[PDB]
Amino acid sequence: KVCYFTANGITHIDYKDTELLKRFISERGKILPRRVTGTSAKYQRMLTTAIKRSRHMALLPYV
Amino acid sequence: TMTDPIADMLTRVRNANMVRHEKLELPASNIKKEIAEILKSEGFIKNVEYVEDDKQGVLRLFLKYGQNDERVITGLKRISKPGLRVYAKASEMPKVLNGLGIALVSTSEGVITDKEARKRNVGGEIIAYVW
Amino acid sequence: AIKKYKPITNGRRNMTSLDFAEITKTTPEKSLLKPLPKKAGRNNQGKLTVRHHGGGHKRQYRVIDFKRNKDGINAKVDSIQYDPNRSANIALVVYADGEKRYIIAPKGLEVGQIVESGAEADIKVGNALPLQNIPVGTVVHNIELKPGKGGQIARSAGASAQVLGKEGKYVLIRLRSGEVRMILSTCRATIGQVGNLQHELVNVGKAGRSRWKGIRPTVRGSVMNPNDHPHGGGEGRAPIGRPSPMSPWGKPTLGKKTRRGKKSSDKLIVRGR
RNA sequence: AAGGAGGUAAAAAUGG
RNA sequence: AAACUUGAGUGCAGAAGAGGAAAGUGGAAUUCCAUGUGUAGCGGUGAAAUGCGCAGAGAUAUGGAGGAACACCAGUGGCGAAGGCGACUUUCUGGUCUGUAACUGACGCUGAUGUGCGAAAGCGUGGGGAUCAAACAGGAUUAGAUACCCUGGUAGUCCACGCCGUAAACGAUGAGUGCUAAGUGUUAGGGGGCCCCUUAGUGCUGCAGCUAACGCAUUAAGCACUCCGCCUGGGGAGUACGACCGCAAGGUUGAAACUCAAAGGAAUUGACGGGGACCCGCACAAGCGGUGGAGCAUGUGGUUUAAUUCGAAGCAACGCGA
Numbered sequence: 071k072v073c074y075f076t077a078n079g080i081t082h083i084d085y086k087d088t089e090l091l092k093r094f095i096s097e098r099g100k101i102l103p104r105r106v107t108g109t110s111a112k113y114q115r116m117l118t119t120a121i122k123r124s125r126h127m128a129l130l131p132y133v
Numbered sequence: 134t135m136t137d138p139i140a141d142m143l144t145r146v147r148n149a150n151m152v153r154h155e156k157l158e159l160p161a162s163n164i165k166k167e168i169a170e171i172l173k174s175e176g177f178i179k180n181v182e183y184v185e186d187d188k189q190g191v192l193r194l195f196l197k198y199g200q201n202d203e204r205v206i207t208g209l210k211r212i213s214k215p216g217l218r219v220y221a222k223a224s225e226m227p228k229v230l231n232g233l234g235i236a237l238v239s240t241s242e243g244v245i246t247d248k249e250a251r252k253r254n255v256g257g258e259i260i261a262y263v264w
Numbered sequence: 265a266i267k268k269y270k271p272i273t274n275g276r277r278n279m280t281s282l283d284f285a286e287i288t289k290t291t292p293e294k295s296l297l298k299p300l301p302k303k304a305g306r307n308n309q310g311k312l313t314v315r316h317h318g319g320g321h322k323r324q325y326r327v328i329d330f331k332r333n334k335d336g337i338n339a340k341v342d343s344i345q346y347d348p349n350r351s352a353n354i355a356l357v358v359y360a361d362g363e364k365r366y367i368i369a370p371k372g373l374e375v376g377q378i379v380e381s382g383a384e385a386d387i388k389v390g391n392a393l394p395l396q397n398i399p400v401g402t403v404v405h406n407i408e409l410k411p412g413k414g415g416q417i418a419r420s421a422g423a424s425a426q427v428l429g430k431e432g433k434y435v436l437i438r439l440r441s442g443e444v445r446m447i448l449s450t451c452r453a454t455i456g457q458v459g460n461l462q463h464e465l466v467n468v469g470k471a472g473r474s475r476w477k478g479i480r481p482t483v484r485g486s487v488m489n490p491n492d493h494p495h496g497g498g499e500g501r502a503p504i505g506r507p508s509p510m511s512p513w514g515k516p517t518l519g520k521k522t523r524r525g526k527k528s529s530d531k532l533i534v535r536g537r
Numbered sequence: 538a539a540g541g542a543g544g545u546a547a548a549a550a551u552g553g
Numbered sequence: 554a555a556a557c558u559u560g561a562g563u564g565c566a567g568a569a570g571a572g573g574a575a576a577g578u579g580g581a582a583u584u585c586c587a588u589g590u591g592u593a594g595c596g597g598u599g600a601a602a603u604g605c606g607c608a609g610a611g612a613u614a615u616g617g618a619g620g621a622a623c624a625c626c627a628g629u630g631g632c633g634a635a636g637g638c639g640a641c642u643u644u645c646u647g648g649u650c651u652g653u654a655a656c657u658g659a660c661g662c663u664g665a666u667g668u669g670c671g672a673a674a675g676c677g678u679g680g681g682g683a684u685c686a687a688a689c690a691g692g693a694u695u696a697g698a699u700a701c702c703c704u705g706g707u708a709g710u711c712c713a714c715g716c717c718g719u720a721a722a723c724g725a726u727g728a729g730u731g732c733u734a735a736g737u738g739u740u741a742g743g744g745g746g747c748c749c750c751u752u753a754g755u756g757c758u759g760c761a762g763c764u765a766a767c768g769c770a771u772u773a774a775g776c777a778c779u780c781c782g783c784c785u786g787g788g789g790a791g792u793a794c795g796a797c798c799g800c801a802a803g804g805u806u807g808a809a810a811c812u813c814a815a816a817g818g819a820a821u822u823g824a825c826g827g828g829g830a831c832c833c834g835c836a837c838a839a840g841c842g843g844u845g846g847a848g849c850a851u852g853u854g855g856u857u858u859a860a861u862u863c864g865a866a867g868c869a870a871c872g873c874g875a
């Protein structure tokens with residue numbers, strides 16, 4: 071399949087882009103696995119770091 | 134790192150012969166070229182080509198197979214090595230396979246075969262056995 | 265910090281001392297000194313009422329500003345000095361109007377640093393503020409019990425307390441002893457921990473050094489006679505030989521609590537040590 | 538469909 | 554003695570990373586403390602009991618204290634010489650990979666002795682202490698149970714600075730170098746048109762060759778060269794003595810007398826397992842009728858007697874030899 075970030079060409083992920091992060095976050099707030107979301111590993115790392123930043127800044131929930 | 138180009142060349146020849154390759158390209162040197170010429174003259178290989186390019190040049194050997202696909206080269210053995218060098222006298226020159234093989238030698242009169250060493254009555258460093 | 269002596273003699277063997285690297289001036293401020301003759305544990309009747317005090321090196325008293333009531337004016341730490349009258353070191357500070365005072369030297373206070381006191385002071389080591397204005401969680405020392413009386417709590421070397429919470433008229437504090445108690449929020453405290461943290465590690469090493477410190481020898485009860493001590497007498501060595509160990513004055517002295525009842529502070533003391 | 542690698546539950550009397 | 558750029562480094566342009574060190578921030582959860590509601594159990598196990606609880610436990614709600622670890626991401630994934638490294642943020646800092654072809658011109662490989670790092674436990678000093686938990690106490694199990702199981706519980710588990718220097722510290726596989734069919738994934742790149750080629754890793758499958766066999770097989774255990782370490786039957790024994798190191802615990806180096814004719818490896822066939830999968834059977838299930846309850850008949854055990862003849866003892870002895 072194809073990766074959202076690879077297709078859209080975006081080469082950076084901003085932790086304040088809560089709407090985008092909600093795409094890859096689960097219903098309960100867990101980070102969806104790469105094999106499910108289709109994302110590449112390179113951008114999966116960026117996504118995890120951005121999601122944890124947002125959790126710290128309370129933009130996104132933990133649980 | 135690399136420590137014995139002659140051993141590397143002999144092992145290249147042995148590996149290519151085992152896999153029944155037709156040609157073999159290796160980096161060149163004068164001693165290697167003389168060894169290849171001796172092999173051709175004795176009939177163990179088919180042809181030898183020298184490519185006078187940059188980076189010391191290349192040797193392109195062409196191996197020889199008889200009828201029934203039998204391998205002309207049965208085996209090559211490095212005799213003298215950097216870790217222990219072997220020399221022999223003219224009267225002590227060894228016969229490879231009771232004479233059916235050649236011993237490549239390095240002498241004051243150039244690198245020759247054991248037959249030529251015995252004929253000219255000279256010794257030297259026994260580079261290798263081929264049979 | 266700690267220097268370990270070589271065993272050149274059995275007296276020096278295992279002895280240690282402070283290296284005094286923190287000290288930056290080895291003489292005191294003349295105008296802040298007062299005489300301190302020794303009492304040797306003898307009261308106004310001339311009688312020994314506390315044992316084991318006497319002799320020891322002569323000492324001058326350094327007047328120390330425990331009150332820290334000179335507010336709104338910066339003071340620059342001129343020096344850190346030795347003080348024989350207490351475990352902590354003391355910092356001579358010079359106020360911007362030219363008045364000089366000693367304060368308890370906090371851990372980390374450096375020569376040339378600035379300190380201030382008052383409700384508006386910043387929360388940094390050596391600043392003094394009302395507990396009203398000190399945040400929860402801050403480590404403090406030299407804590408007042410009555411506003412304006414001067415610090416009385418957490419003044420020894422390495423001492424500190426932690427602000428825990430703020431009730432109406434009182435602030436909760438955890439003292440070095442582990443006690444948690446209330447203190448009037450108008451009382452002042454100094455930010456930080458008292459310096460000279462290695463004080464407690466010193467191995468005094470020999471009897472004479474205690475004598476220099478003015479401590480006379482402690483004779484054990486069990487090696488006196490019955491008329492001297494409840495533990496006295498018995499042929500040869502003897503065990504305590506009664507239900508509880510006793511003080512020289514005939515009171516139980518292992519586990520017996522002595523804090524008096526019906527004290528005003530009992531409703532301020534939230535959790536004992 | 539059959540084999541290889543990781544994690545991971547639930548169960549448990551005793552002696553042959 | 555003089556040249557070269559292929560090895561080795563450097564410059565230039567790029568890539569990823571739980572590599573390391575120090576500070577700071579954060580959510581979940583456990584324990585404890587206080588308080589409101591509330592009643593007689595909680596907890597635990599194969600089943601129980603110790604223990605906790607009518608002085609109000611356990612449950613529930615709120616707040617506080619404090620320590621420790623970072624759920625999802627997470628992957629034969631990444632990084633590191635190895636040990637190891639997984640919340641996030643900032644500072645300092647190491648290494649590696651890709652392309653390029655200015656630059657040096659063999660400056661390389663290995664490496665005895667040496668010098669450092671090195672999981673966990675452990676030692677010293679000072680802190681810290683939630684959880685878990687050697688020792689230990691009680692309960693249970695048992696013929697016994699110094700255990701496995703349950704209830705507690707100290708060192709320790711955490712931090713700083715020193716010490717120790719060992720592990721199945723393993724890929725049980727020393728380092729460097731070249732050469733020898735292929736197919737297919739994945740991590741980080743590069744070049745030419747989803748395809749092809751290509752570099753460095755990381756996996757699987759598999760030729761030639763190797764191997765006692767199992768298996769290895771471009772990440773060799775194939776073919777070769779260089780250097781280092783190590784082995785020479787099993788015990789005795791990693792012991793003794795000596796030496797060096799350590800606070801200690803112990804570490805490193807390291808025999809012999811004596812004793813046996815074996816000890817070992819891989820694989821094969823059986824047998825067995827308080828190993829597994831599947832298939833079948835009045836084995837369960839469905840259903841009818843019984844036995845176990847009463848009297849009596851009969852056989853058996855037991856007891857008794859002079860003898861109560863002998864034989865049969867789980868199914869597969871007991872209306873059995875009869």
Ligand SMILES: [Mg+2]
Nearest residue numbers: 315316317482
């Ligand atoms: Mg005394």
Ligand SMILES: [Mg+2]
Nearest residue numbers: 487488489497
């Ligand atoms: Mg006496």
Ligand SMILES: [Mg+2]
Nearest residue numbers: 490491493494
């Ligand atoms: Mg008396």
Ligand SMILES: [Mg+2]
Nearest residue numbers: 495498504505
């Ligand atoms: Mg007595």
Ligand SMILES: [Mg+2]
Nearest residue numbers: 499500501502
């Ligand atoms: Mg006696």
Ligand SMILES: [Mg+2]
Nearest residue numbers: 673674675710
């Ligand atoms: Mg440890």
Ligand SMILES: [Mg+2]
Nearest residue numbers: 686703704705
């Ligand atoms: Mg236990």
Ligand SMILES: [Mg+2]
Nearest residue numbers: 719720721722
């Ligand atoms: Mg070892």
Ligand SMILES: [Mg+2]
Nearest residue numbers: 721722723725
């Ligand atoms: Mg080993």
Ligand SMILES: [Mg+2]
Nearest residue numbers: 753754755772
């Ligand atoms: Mg590869």
